[PDB]
Symmetry: D6
Subunit: 162 residues, 12 copies
Amino acid sequence: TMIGRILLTVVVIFRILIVAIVGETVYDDEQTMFVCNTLQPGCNQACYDRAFPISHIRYWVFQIIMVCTPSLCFITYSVHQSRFYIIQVVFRNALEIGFLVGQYFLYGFSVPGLYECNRYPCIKEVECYVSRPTEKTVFLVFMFAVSGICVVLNLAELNHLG
Amino acid sequence: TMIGRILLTVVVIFRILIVAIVGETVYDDEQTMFVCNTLQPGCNQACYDRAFPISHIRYWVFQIIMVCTPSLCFITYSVHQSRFYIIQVVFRNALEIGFLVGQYFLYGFSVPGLYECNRYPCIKEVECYVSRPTEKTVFLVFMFAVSGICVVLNLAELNHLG
Amino acid sequence: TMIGRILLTVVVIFRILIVAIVGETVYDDEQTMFVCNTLQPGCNQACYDRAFPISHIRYWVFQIIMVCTPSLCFITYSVHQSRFYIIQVVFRNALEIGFLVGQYFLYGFSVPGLYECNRYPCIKEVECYVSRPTEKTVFLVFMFAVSGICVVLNLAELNHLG
Amino acid sequence: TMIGRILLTVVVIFRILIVAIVGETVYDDEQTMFVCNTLQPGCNQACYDRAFPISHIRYWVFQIIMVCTPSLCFITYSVHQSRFYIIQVVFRNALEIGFLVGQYFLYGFSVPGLYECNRYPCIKEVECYVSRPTEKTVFLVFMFAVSGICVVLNLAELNHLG
Amino acid sequence: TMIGRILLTVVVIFRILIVAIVGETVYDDEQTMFVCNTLQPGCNQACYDRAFPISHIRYWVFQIIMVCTPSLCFITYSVHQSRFYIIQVVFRNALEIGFLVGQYFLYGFSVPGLYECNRYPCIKEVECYVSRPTEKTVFLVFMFAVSGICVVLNLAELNHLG
Amino acid sequence: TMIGRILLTVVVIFRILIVAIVGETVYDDEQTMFVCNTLQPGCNQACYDRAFPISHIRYWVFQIIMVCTPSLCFITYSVHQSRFYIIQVVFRNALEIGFLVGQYFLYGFSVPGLYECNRYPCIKEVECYVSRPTEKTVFLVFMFAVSGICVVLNLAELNHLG
Amino acid sequence: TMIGRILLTVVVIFRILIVAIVGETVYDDEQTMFVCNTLQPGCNQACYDRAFPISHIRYWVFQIIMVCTPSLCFITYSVHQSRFYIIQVVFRNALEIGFLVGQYFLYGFSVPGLYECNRYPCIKEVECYVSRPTEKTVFLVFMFAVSGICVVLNLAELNHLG
Amino acid sequence: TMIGRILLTVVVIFRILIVAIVGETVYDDEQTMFVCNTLQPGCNQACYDRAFPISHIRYWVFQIIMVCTPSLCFITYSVHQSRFYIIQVVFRNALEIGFLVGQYFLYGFSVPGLYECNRYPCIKEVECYVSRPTEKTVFLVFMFAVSGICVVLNLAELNHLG
Amino acid sequence: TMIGRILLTVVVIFRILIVAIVGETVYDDEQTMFVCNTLQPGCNQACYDRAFPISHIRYWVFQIIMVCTPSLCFITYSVHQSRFYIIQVVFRNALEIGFLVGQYFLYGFSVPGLYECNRYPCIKEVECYVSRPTEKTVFLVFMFAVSGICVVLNLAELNHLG
Amino acid sequence: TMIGRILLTVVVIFRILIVAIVGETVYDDEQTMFVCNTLQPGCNQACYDRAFPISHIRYWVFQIIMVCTPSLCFITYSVHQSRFYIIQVVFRNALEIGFLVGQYFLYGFSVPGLYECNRYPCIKEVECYVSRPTEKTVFLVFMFAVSGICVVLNLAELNHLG
Amino acid sequence: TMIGRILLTVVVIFRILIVAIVGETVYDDEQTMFVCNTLQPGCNQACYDRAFPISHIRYWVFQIIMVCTPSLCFITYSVHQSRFYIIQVVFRNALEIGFLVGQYFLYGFSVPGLYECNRYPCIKEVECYVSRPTEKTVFLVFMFAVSGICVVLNLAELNHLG
Amino acid sequence: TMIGRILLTVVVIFRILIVAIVGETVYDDEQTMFVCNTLQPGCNQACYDRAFPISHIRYWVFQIIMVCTPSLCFITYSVHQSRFYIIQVVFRNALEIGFLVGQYFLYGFSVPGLYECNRYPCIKEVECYVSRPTEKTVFLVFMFAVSGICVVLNLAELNHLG
């Protein structure tokens, strides 16, 4: 139970570093290199918006910021100065399970190279083509693995205290 | 009444972080990906200007900066060194209610994908198409929720002292 | 007379923050989205240069830097270490009135959406179209209001000492 | 055995500096200057994705971050406060050998100027042309040499203690 | 003679701030908005290179860095620890007069809007058009004025000691 | 022999500052403004790669970093704590002579405005045109002069101790 | 009544010559120089078809051919060989009055330079521009005048016989 | 029965004149003004070929030539020189009924303005737009009416002789 | 008076031949090579229509046909078969004087190379450029000379009979 | 045997009329509407030349002219004036069988819509698309049928005389 | 003197045939393939007009028609029916010498491939390129030779009669 | 010797028909489909002019017209009315041998698909691509064969008379 805290801290810092340093530049050209086979003005905008409603990197930044709020609350309380420890552990567990489930329900496990679109002003159905699908799939899988590790560790400690 | 201060501080910091880190890059391509169905030079400029007079991110930065002025005044006074506390609380309450009302009156609750324009030099009425409407709607709703929380908390403390 | 100093310091810091954080990005696309109805090479350059000789943001940065020089002089003198206080107050007053008058004479109170140009190599008179006129007008008015407040406060203190 | 530690530290810092300062800007135009001889929409995307599944710089950043985790664990343990030293040395050795082998299996020793592509929606086989192949080959060879040096040094110390 | 040092320090800092904060962004589009009336490939490159051999901002950065070297030498000497003071004053005077003369001989007092070019591969003489000439002329004049002030002050002190 | 160390330190810092602040922005448009007279897809890539195998700025950054390694080794040794001084001086001398010779053999003393290319897929020989040749020639000459000064000084001290 | 036949024959031949020699080349560019202010594919086709359902020259050729059929019938009868004369005169009168009335109801008296179109796939209403409107108006008026003359003459002879 | 021959001859000559003089120029731009909403090379060719397999004017020329062959045979026989009259009348009747039926089965009674296409290399279904549909519909109806008249007359004479 | 008839016949035939053989091909590209300096759709059509309301060649064909009508009337009368001779001579004289006067009032004596246009949808005044002005001026002058000769001859004969 | 000559003459005239009146305008756009999926200059020319070495209409005109030479020889002989009749019949038979066989060996029975090309300067194999394949197939089949009829008739008469 | 008339008639007919059959199609693309190195609208029109004021083929048609007028006069006289023969011979001689001299003074003996133009709206001097110069030079020389032959023959006969 | 005249007449008429009916339309697109791999304005004109100085069809028309002049002379002589027969036969023989030799020396026996050009304004050597080379080669060979036949026949008759 001693090493579990050390590894939780290391996993958290590793995740923050990976997201902060490289993720902002895989997605930089997401819409500029999205293209559809069509001559209709406005079809690219509608089809990109329907294929990618919220970008992965925004979701990950939001999750990272939201999973650090109980610590800030505890720190502010202690600065003003055991039950608080229990409650914040419970809240962190709940938040991390919710975020992992939401990731699975929003994105799945892969990013395909083709997309079929039928939104106005596009006439009937059109075919569109995605940028960098393999790298984005790799990123998806890596983030899922890290978040799973964190969930396991927090449940470990929750059950250790009981 | 003890936790209310802690949560107000946490909400303020959370809002600042969310605005500072991600909001500058959803709106980056706002005008470059705005397009209208027309062959008239200058119509895109006029229609973009009429559809989006002040961008959301400018309004939010201004609001964030303006709601922190009473604290700076109090700090400068104390550095030079109860009535001041009362007055600054009143002013903060008023400013935050004004900004929330102004947000509601300026933008509403959604960003549509189509816009109908009838400004010179456009001939009669033309149709234009917006970039990333869903993400911008999500951002709008999130910011409204946070500001509502802050209003509630400040009224709480105002009525607590009385 | 006590609060006047506090509010002058707060106004100065507020102005610096507003100029530094957001103003660099309203004007970023000033020339790339300026367009004229013409087929003559070189007409866009001449008409943009005649319409906007010095950009607003350059003038504001220069003014902000120049109104802080008497303080730097006083600080350097004191570091090396009442008449100096008097003289620097006088100089600050003069500089701020000069800059406000110059702003009024250079730009006025609005930025129009159309511009009429008659400069070589343009044949006769041509019509050109501006980017983001409403936001720029709002910025103009806000900056004028802040500078007026600062002028009033400095005259207040000048007349207080006498 | 005294100098070996000094040179390991120097090699690590040298590698970090080289990757951090210059590598982000050789690869900046990787996809914008990739071009294929074709008139089919979407062929450039598919052929670029098949030729470069994971960019070199992403792999190198990931490797650099992952080879510094045992040190962070040891530091966190000591902050909380010989077997740990042994175990972390073993783990570092294993990680660095794995990463070097993976580099060899993923990329080889050269980047060619031409690429032959046969992925949908491209009709039959098409020819594509790469940007900056010589500089990228030089970078590949340099990184392999540095990582080899590091492997040798860590095996040296492992066998020194035994 | 007391105030002369204070004003020299203030002028130096003012010049550094003006060059560092704004000058990098007037010249950003220098070549992208340079255009010539021609259909010959390569003529724009040759004519831009002949019209602007060294950009103003490079010259000013170089001058600013080179006029601060005697101070660094004196500081390093004193850290290791009157004749040195004399010699460094002489050297600074010489360097600043040389740089002002070189500026006058390289650029003059204005930037014109048209340029006439006769370099290969351009056929006979062609006409080209410059970006932002008025702002660049204003910058030229301002920098000349500041450097003149600095020259006057340094000669003042040189003759004061004698 | 006293001043020689001071001037060596000043030259090193001057070189680092010049390379770090301005050199990254002369070369920014190196490939985007390279153009050849041809209609063949892929010829620009091959001819640019053959004309500029390694960019000047990469070579200079690498050289600057590599000539500071003996100092880092000596510092790490002393932190752990005359022969080391001797050896590191010898190594620095050798490295700086090698880098100067390599510069001369790689680039020479000028950058021409035209380039003649005969690489596949270009048909026979084609003519291409370079961006900013004069500024790049000036930079080449300046860097050679500085490195020569450094070589002279290090040989001076080597022969002083003997 | 003697000259009436001579002038009828001369008018008929004059009309045939004018239609046959020049009319085919005023209308040659009717659709190639028709243009609408729009970016929608297919709008030009629909708007041209709605503005000009049957071209003038087709109608005039058809009318000219149809008003010569009674003569051909009479000639064929006589070749095979007073009541027939009467009947054919009646039929010619009726046909020429019908054709003049139809011309008035189909085309009117002018061809305007602008046209307002609201047909699918055009979005809302668009503005289109016509080629050579003045010449076509002149042709319309001339043809109406000639046909009126012919009607008058044929009624003259009809009433002469009775 | 006397006039029937005269009117048959007149109808035949009228049809020949109408087809020969004007029909070649309604269809002249048939493929050059056919356009589809797509970016796929080769789709316009396939969709035009599927929409219009044999052009109307070719069919009409062929029919006109083929319905005059029995007369040529009879003329050649008589030049070499009642049963032949009978047989040629029968054959003409059969040929004209066959051609009218074939017209009805090939083309129908209208030409629509839109066409829906699903032929390779077009992806799924695309929409295409036709040139001059109303004029072509008018021509179709006129030709059907004339051919009906001719059929009626030939049956009349066939039944007259019996 | 004998030769006058011979020369009138020769002049008439010469004029007909010159108009019929070459004039149709100087004017063929009249609108396709007409160009204006503008980006407004529809401006070329309006400005061409205002500059050239009726083309020269149409006017000349009409005049040639109309001056031969009295001869056709006289021929038809004589075929059916001195006062008629007198009347037709008078009518021919009147028609030829009217046509010459109309030519002078419609076109003048030259065709300029530039045209200044101020018709909707053109914004203010624009400059347009004409095709083949010198050849058209030569043609104008030649036709005026020939028509003058014909007028003189017909007046000669009119006064000869009296 | 009497009717055989009449039908041979009718078939010959029918074939000449069909070829002369319509065939020149199906093939008019043969190369202008031929397109290949490629960016290589010169590939369209080579692939069109390899797909269609001799156009159908040229072959048919040549055949028609060459099968009428024996008649011209016989006519010229008789004008100068039974064995000649025999010889010319034999020659006509041979020529018509040769031309039919050559048609079968050159073109076959269909024109496909796609063509696969591998000629320099095209890189590897490319796909090209044909204009009006169905109409051209119909024309091929019709011409084969007519020529077969003619062959049968000429063999008939040859065997009739013996 | 007998053969001279025969050869004059043959030369005249040969010249007419050569001009009528082929000359109309060398000059067909005269302005469409004329191109200048410039970006100025309207420069091509002015430079083409200045380089080719009257096209060769127009001059040759005019000359051919004008040298046949004396024959028409003589024919008309004889139809109405030695001195006339004399006078018409004199006139033909004069006309043919005048036309040959005018050709020499208008065009010379060659058509160059380059043209240097300095007409408004072209800026300074521009270079333009001609279509088919060699064929046009050959045509010039051939026409001069034929006209010389005709002049010689007519002088021959003039001096023969005396 | 009887049939030789008949076959000469037939060959002459056959050649005239083949040249007149089809040859004008193989060469119609000769320059419009000529293309070179270059970006230099004016290079296509110079290279086309150097590759094809005189077009085949012009040479063939000229030859056909010139080989019929002796017949016209003989006809004109006889109309005015054995040695003349002899002389004209000799002249025809000479002319036909000269024209065949000139054809061989001007064009050879094939038309290649590629052409290598080195004429100003083209830089060094460029590659260009020809239209319809195979058809043009076939035409060349056919014309050579026919002219050879004619030469043989005329020599036959020349030697027959002696």
